[PDB]
Amino acid sequence: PHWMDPQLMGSQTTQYSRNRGYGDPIRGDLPIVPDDGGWFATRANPAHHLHTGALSMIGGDASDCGSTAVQQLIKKYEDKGCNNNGLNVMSSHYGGV
């Protein structure tokens, strides 16, 4: 039952450096391993030097959802084979490169 327990009882969240602000809010910072040494080797901490981005929750394409279930549904549903009353249409792919 010491005095001033509340100040020393608990924990505080990590505080980020001013460099973290420049990171892309949507796309997380690229994972780059820091270097060490005694010659101009900055030992910056990625924990408060990297930005995780906003993609972590929105992305994932687990089973349904995302940009794969809709891809499969569109590919299955859109019709193929001749045109008859028309001039033929090709299937446009929405994949990445």
């Binding site: 039952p1 005095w3 001033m4 509340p6 608990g10 924990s11 505080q12 969240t13 809010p25």
Partner: protein, 462 residues
Amino acid sequence: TCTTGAGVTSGFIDLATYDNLDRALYGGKDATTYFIKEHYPVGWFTKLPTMATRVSGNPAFGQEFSVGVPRSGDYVLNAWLTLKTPEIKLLETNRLGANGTVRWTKNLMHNAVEHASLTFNDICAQQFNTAYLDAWTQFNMCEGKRIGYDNMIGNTSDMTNPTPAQGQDGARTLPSKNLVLPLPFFFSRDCGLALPTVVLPYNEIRINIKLRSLQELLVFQNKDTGNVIPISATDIAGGLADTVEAYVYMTVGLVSNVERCAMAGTVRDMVVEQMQAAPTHIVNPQNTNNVHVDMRFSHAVKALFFMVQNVTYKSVGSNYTCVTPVNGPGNTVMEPAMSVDPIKSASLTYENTTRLANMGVEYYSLVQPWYFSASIPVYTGYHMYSYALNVGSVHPSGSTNYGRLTNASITVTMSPESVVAAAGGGNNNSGYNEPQRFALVVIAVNHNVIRIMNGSMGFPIL
């Protein structure tokens, strides 16, 4: 039929109208019914008021006094401050002479009560001031209690009525009546959140209140030109009573012995709401028409209350209008010819990502309070933006934590009325006769978690 006075058959034809659509709404074996209220037992408890013993000096205007919370109870759930106003007697030998009136400031309470803080041992857990008090009382005011709150805190059309000198027609004495201000705290927000004094035997609970000097509480108006100058001891008879008597009354409760020892020795987590104010920013509409303020907050903010406060005269307070009030006919204060909020539009930016565009001032003034609050302010100013569905609800709703958020900024565009009132040139009794100055204030309300264990409190997340 007949349909006599004691007629009941008319409802049977209404009951007969039931097919294929009311089956979804009414009916069913599990359907509840009205006229049969389920009764459940509740706890056994009593409550009574209790004086709080002073610990640091005596109350005095312009000074700070501290009072220790009375322990040995079971739960503390109300606290309020009562203070008796002095007696004001104008003198014919005043500096302004015949053309001079003295009156109490608008919202006498919420003024001379600032930096009201609650401390556990030697660490602060909550602190509020005038701007937060005004915004909260204007945005979360239950109707029917408005007249009572006005009688409690001043502006009762009797304290703030200008009084001329003794030799003039108006020689009324300003009454010396006691006023009561409830203290909004996390334990006072709801009866569910109450301080466990039985579970806190080691911590010491203290409340610090700092008043304001009497010089910056009396409006010394000029009768004709509407000029405000600081008051002096020789201006009024009897001098200035620096020392005043003030009491803090607190309500404690008691619980049954079966549950007093049942919950002893447990780890408890409580969710509370607190405030945090951005530093003031002087606004000069003459140079630039836009003003940007950086908001640097930490926890999960719930709403942002902002307004622009006229700061030309220190004597006048709670004036968020581009023109200061002046004396009017019948020895009553009247609003000037033009009285509009200096804010024209506002926007929010998250590091070059504008979340909220240049929306009009009427949005924050009317649309937001009508949807996500309990009341709409009746005075000009007091704009808000709430991230939560209901501001007044203690239960957490949608919110964002600014700790992981980058530097956020708020931008405000000035108004033509403010930019023309900033310079002088106003005529007599126009309010803006002298050049006007404005300041911007930002208030944030956020959530936090308090842990009780081992007979002590603390913040597990800081």
